[PDB]
Amino acid sequence: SDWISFSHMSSDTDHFPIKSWFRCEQKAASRSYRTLGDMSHPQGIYEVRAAITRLISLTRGVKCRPEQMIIGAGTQVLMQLLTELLPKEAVYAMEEPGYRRMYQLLKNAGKQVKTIMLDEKGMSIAEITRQQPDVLVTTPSHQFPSGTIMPVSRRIQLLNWAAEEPRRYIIEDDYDSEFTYDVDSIPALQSLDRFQNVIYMGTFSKSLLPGLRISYMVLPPELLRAYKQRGYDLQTCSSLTQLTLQEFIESGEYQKHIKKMKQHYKEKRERLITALEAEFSGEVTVKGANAGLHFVTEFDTRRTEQDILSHAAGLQLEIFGMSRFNLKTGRPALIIGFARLKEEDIQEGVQRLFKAVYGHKKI
Amino acid sequence: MIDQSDWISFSHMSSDTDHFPIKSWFRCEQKAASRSYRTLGDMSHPQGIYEVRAAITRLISLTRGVKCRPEQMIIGAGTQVLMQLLTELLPKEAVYAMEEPGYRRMYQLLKNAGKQVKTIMLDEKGMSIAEITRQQPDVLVTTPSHQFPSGTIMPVSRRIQLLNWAAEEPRRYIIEDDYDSEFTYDVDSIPALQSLDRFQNVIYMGTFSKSLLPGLRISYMVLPPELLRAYKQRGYDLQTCSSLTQLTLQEFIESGEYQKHIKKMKQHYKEKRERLITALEAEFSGEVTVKGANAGLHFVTEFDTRRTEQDILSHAAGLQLEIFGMSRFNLKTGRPALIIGFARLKEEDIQEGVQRLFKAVYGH
C-alpha cells in the first residue's frame, strides 16, 4: 500500500523491539511454565504489579502499594469495573472534547455524565464547580484530544475541589504520558494529592503496541476494599503476557525502549512541524504539541471537515477530524498523530493534506 | 516420612501444562507474527480479527455443528467478560436462571449486577424444564453437553423442551455454555444445542481456555441477530484479546496443530478415564457409584459409606489428596458425592490416588 498515516490511534511497529519482547516472553515462559496455569490472581500477578509500581513511581511520581493495583486487558474493562466500585449514583464529568468511547460507556451504564469544556489550562474548574459532579475523568499529561498540558495550578484546583467534600473522585487517565518534548515532566495528579481522591489509570498500549492490551489502575484503599469484597473477578491479561511485561521492565528493555523512542518522536515531531510550517507558511495553526504522540492543526480554508477528510481518504492519507471527539462550525481542525508516520513520508505527507484541504498546490 | 509435596490432585479446575504442545504454540505465534506484524499496530476489530473469527467458526461448525457466521461472533478474554457484555445486551430487567448445582462465579457476577437469578434443579435429563416453567425466568444458563458439575448430558428431547419454552414468549433467551465440550467418550456425540435453534433464541458460549496455553483466556460468544444489533448500537467496545494471541490461535487452528492436539489429548483422556474407572471399580467393588462420565474431564462418585462428605474431604487433605465435594457447587444431604477431575492427574498416580481415596471414604 501507498498509505501515509497521520493517525493518532495507530502505533509504531518499525521501532518497537519485537525480538526483545519475544525473548522476554521466552525467558518468562522458561522461568514459570510449571506455574502458568496457577498464577491467576484476579488483580494481576503480584510481582508484575510490583514491577509496574516501581516503574510508575520512578517515571511519574505515583506513590502506591502493589496491592492497590489492578491489571486489565485494556482501559475499558478497568473503567467498567471502576464504575461498579464507585457509588452507583455518582455523577460523572468528562472533558469536552474528550474520549467519546468512554463517554458512551458511562452513558450506556445509565450514569449522568456532565461535559466540562476546556480552557487554556485544561479541564475547566469553573464548569466543574458550577455543575457539581462527583467523579472527574481527566487527561492531565496531554489532554485528549486538544493536547493541553494541565499546569500544576489547575491540578491543585482539581485536588482542592475533590478534597472539599466527601466522596468526590478524580480518575486520572495518564494516557500518552511516556513522552515530553520541549518541556519537562510534571508530577501526576495522584502524586500531588495529599489525600487519596485520585484513581490513577495507565496503559502500556502507546508504549508497546495497541495489538497487545495491558492497562492498570491504582485504587484508593477504600475502593480497593469494595473491589476485594466482590469475590468473583478473573484477571483478563494472560499470565504469560503479564510475566513478559515484568521481564521487559525488570530487564531494563522497557526503559531503554522509552528513551530511544523519546528521541525518535521528538525529532519526528520537530521535522513534521517545520514541514507543516513550510507547506502552509502561516495558514496552519498548530497547538497541543508539547507532549504525547499527536497535536492539533487548524486550517484556514473553505471546505467542510467531512469533505477534507473525505478527500484525504481518497489521497490515502489516514487522518481524523477533531469533530470525532465531541461528547455532544469554525475553521477545520484535524488530529495529526505521528506515531506510525515514517520520517521518509513527512514531506509527501503534508502534501495530500495541503491538497485534501481543497485540491491543489499551485506555486 | 510423609513427603509434603506428594500431592495427588483430583481437582477439576485444571489443565495439564505437561501435555500442551507449548513449542508448537510458540512456533505458530512466530509464524503469525512474521505474516502480520505490520498489523499488530492497528486496532483489532472490536468483535475480534475477522479471519480469527472465521477460523473459529469453521472449527465449531465441524466439531459441534454450531451454525453461525463470523459476523455474529464476539471474541473476549475469558467467558466472564463476554457474560458481562451479554448482561448489558439483554434487557436490564431480565430474570436469569442457572442450574443448581452450578457455576457459583457466574451466579455471583449476575447477583452483583443486581439481577434476579433463579436456581433451577436438575433431573435425569439436566436442567428442569418443570422448574423453569414454574419459576418463570427470562434467560436460561445451561450446560447441555456435560452439566457442570453433575455431568449429565442433556438429551435432545429436553433441549427441544427448552427451545420450545424460549420461543413461546418474547425476550426469552438460552445461553448455551459449552465449556469442556472438546471431549466425548464412546457415547453421546451430540452436537450443540444451538444447532437446533430454528428461532434464534440461543447464545452459544465457547472457550479455548481448557484447550490451550495455561494462563491464557480466549473465549467467544455467538449472538443471535437482535443481540448482535444491540451490540453494534453501542459503538465503543474494545477487543480484550491481544491481536497477536488471536493470530496465534488462528495459526494454531489453520496449521492443523489445534486438531492434532485435541485428537491426542482426547485419546489420552479416554484412556486415563478408563484406567481410573477400572481402578475405582476394583478398589471399591460396588461401594462406589460413578455417574456423569462419557464426556468432559470430571465425573461424580457417590460413596457407600457412613462417613460424612466432609469427613471424606478432611481425611483427603490428610492423605495429600486434592478432591472436591459436590456441596461446593451449590449456588444458594445424604450419601457423600465427590467431583473426580482427572485433568491434572498423572497416570503414575491413578492406583495410589484411588487407594488414598478408599481410606478417605472408609478410614481404613
Ligand SMILES: Cc1ncc(/C=C/c2nnn[nH]2)c(/C=N/[C@@H](CCC(=O)O)COc2ccccc2)c1O
Ligand atoms: C484518553 C484515552 N484513554 C484511553 C484510551 C485507550 C486505551 C487503551 N489502553 N489499553 N487498551 N486501550 C484512549 C485511546 N483510544 C484509541 C483511539 C481514541 C479514539 O479515537 O476513539 C487509541 O487506542 C490506542 C491505539 C494505539 C496505542 C495505544 C492506544 C484515549 O484517547
Ligand SMILES: Cc1ncc(/C=C/c2nnn[nH]2)c(/C=N/[C@@H](CCC(=O)O)COc2ccccc2)c1O
Ligand atoms: C459451567 C462453566 N462455564 C464456564 C467456565 C469457565 C470459563 C472460562 N473460560 N475462560 N475463562 N473462563 C466454568 C469454569 N469452571 C472453573 C471453575 C470451577 C468452580 O469453582 O466451580 C474450573 O475450571 C473448569 C473445570 C472443569 C471444566 C471447565 C473449567 C464453568 O464451570
